[PDB]
Design a protein around this ligand. Structure first.
Ligand SMILES: CCCS(=O)(=O)Nc1ccc(F)c(C(=O)c2c[nH]c3ncc(Cl)cc23)c1F
Length: 266
């Protein structure tokens, strides 16, 4: 409520990309900020109460490895204001184009697992984990985005599957469906991206082919492409996260404990 940034305080600039329910912009309001412009303009009584409940959730769910909520807007569009992360997204680094030392590669995974251990402990299902939602704030601390509006994601379904699907668990394709284990699968794809510097199924230039094959469980990421310097324990953890049978996947407590243990390596 006292989190509503008043009319004409944020200077909306450079279009960054598009998160869950909105479009991200680089803004300015007492320094650098990020603004997610939601696709809602004239909020009805129910719409405005729904959005204010998620803002109440946003100001109650704080963590060093999840994006920092700064406030909201109602005019001219419903928007979410967060902290700005100067080092952009992990996708931007890894894929566009190449390099990080094995220590750092393990450190991002570790910090993503730390944030996700916090989100799962607050009974929040992320629904949309990907490298484009993992931001490098520097202080050199990973920041998880798109975790908010979780109840709105549950109340709806999503069709905005493309352009994504790469981090979607097989059960999420063949439409339970979203769980903590589906979040573990997306994290497994993140681990793949980290240890391989490539996206899964980068040879395919078609969507419905990936939907049929990943969904039926005939396709999966090519693990043979893992770096030679990737420790054994990490290639194994990655496989456990990516397991087709959803209830075989590890929990974030066990995920984090494996990363902590394999980080030594002194
Ligand atoms: C505390 C709520 C976070 S969120 O779940 O609603 N997701 C969200 C909301 C608003 C945003 F601007 C962003 C976002 O993408 C960024 C926040 N800070 C950033 N810094 C750099 C880049 Cl490239 C992107 C962002 C974002 F991920």
């Amino acid at each position: 409520d006292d989190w509503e940034i008043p009319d004409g305080q944020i200077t909306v600039g450079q279009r960054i990309g598009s998160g869950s329910f909105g479009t991200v912009y680089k803004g300015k309001w007492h320094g650098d900020v990020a603004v997610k412009m939601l696709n809602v303009t004239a909020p009805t009584p129910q719409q405005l109460q729904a959005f204010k409940n998620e803002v109440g959730v946003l100001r109650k769910t704080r963590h060093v490895n999840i994006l920092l909520f700064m406030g909201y807007s109602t005019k001219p569009q419903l928007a979410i204001v967060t902290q700005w992360c100067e080092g952009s997204s992990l996708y931007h680094h890894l894929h566009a184009s190449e390099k990080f030392e094995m220590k750092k590669l393990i450190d991002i995974a570790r910090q993503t697992a730390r944030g996700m251990d916090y989100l799962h402990a607050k009974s929040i299902i992320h629904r949309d984990l990907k490298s484009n939602n993992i931001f490098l704030h520097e202080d050199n601390t990973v920041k998880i985005g798109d975790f908010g509006l979780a109840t709105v994601k549950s109340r709806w379904s999503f069709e905005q599957l493309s352009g994504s699907i790469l981090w979607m668990a097989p059960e999420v394709i063949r439409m339970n469906p979203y769980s903590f284990q589906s979040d573990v699968y997306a994290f497994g794809i993140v681990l793949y991206e980290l240890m391989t510097g490539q996206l899964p199924y980068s040879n395919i230039n078609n969507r419905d082919q990936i939907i049929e094959m990943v969904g039926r469980g005939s396709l999966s990421p090519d693990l043979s492409k893992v770096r030679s310097n990737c420790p054994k324990r990490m290639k194994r953890l990655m496989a456990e996260c990516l397991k087709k049978k959803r209830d075989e996947r590890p929990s974030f407590p066990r995920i984090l404990a494996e990363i902590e243990e394999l980080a030594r390596e002194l």
